[PDB]
C-alpha cells in the first residue's frame, strides 16, 4: 500500500455533489503532461449509491473534444479504499477530506513495473483554497511525485479546464 496516509472514520454519503480538481501530481510526466495525457482527469460530480459504491463523473480530453465519463468504483472492506474496473485493478484512497471544503486523494496501477500513481486536491468551490494545497503538498513529501500542476478560478469554470 505504497501510500501511507488514509481517512479514518470516512464517511462516504457526506462528499457527494460538486467538486474541482484545483492540483494534480503524478509519479510521472507522461501520465500528466498533456492535454491527452492517460491520467489528465477532471473531477465534476461525486455520486455514492444506497450499497456505498461511488459514482464518478469525470471529463477527459478525447478525439480533440472534452469528453463526459462515468466510471463507478466499487467499494471494499476498507472504507477509504475502493476499486476502479478496467484491464486492471486501480486501488483509490482517500487520504483526509473535512467534507465541506475539500479531500485528497491518489490513485496506484497495482502493481504496474516501478508503479504509476495519480494524486488530487479536490476542492468544492472555484477558490484557490491556500490551506488544502498545505495539506496536499505535505502529503506528498513522502511520495515520489515528478510532475505537479494547478489551475486558476477561470479554468476551473471551463469544460477540461481550457
Ligand atoms: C474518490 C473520488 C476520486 C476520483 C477518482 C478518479 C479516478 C480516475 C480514473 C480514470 C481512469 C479511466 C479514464 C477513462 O475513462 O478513459
Given at each position: 500500500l505504497i501510500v501511507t496516509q488514509t481517512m479514518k472514520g470516512?464517511?462516504?454519503?457526506?462528499?457527494?455533489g460538486t467538486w474541482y480538481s484545483l492540483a494534480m501530481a503524478a509519479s510521472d510526466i507522461s501520465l500528466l503532461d498533456a492535454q491527452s495525457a492517460p491520467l489528465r482527469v477532471y473531477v465534476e460530480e461525486l455520486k455514492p449509491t444506497p450499497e456505498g459504491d461511488l459514482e464518478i463523473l469525470l471529463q477527459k480530453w478525447e478525439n480533440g473534444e472534452c469528453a463526459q465519463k462515468k466510471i463507478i468504483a466499487e467499494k471494499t472492506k476498507i472504507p477509504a479504499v475502493f476499486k476502479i474496473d478496467a484491464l486492471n485493478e486501480n486501488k483509490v484512497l482517500v487520504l483526509?477530506?473535512?467534507?465541506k471544503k475539500y479531500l485528497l486523494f491518489c490513485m496506484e496501477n497495482s502493481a504496474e513495473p516501478e508503479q504509476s500513481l495519480a494524486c488530487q486536491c479536490l476542492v468544492?468551490?472555484?477558490?484557490?483554497?491556500d490551506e488544502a494545497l498545505e495539506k496536499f503538498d505535505k502529503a506528498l513529501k513522502a511520495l515520489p511525485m515528478h510532475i505537479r500542476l494547478s489551475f486558476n478560478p477561470t479554468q476551473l469554470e471551463e469544460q477540461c479546464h481550457i
Open positions: 470516512l464517511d462516504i454519503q457526506k462528499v457527494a483526509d477530506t473535512d467534507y468544492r468551490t472555484p477558490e484557490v483554497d
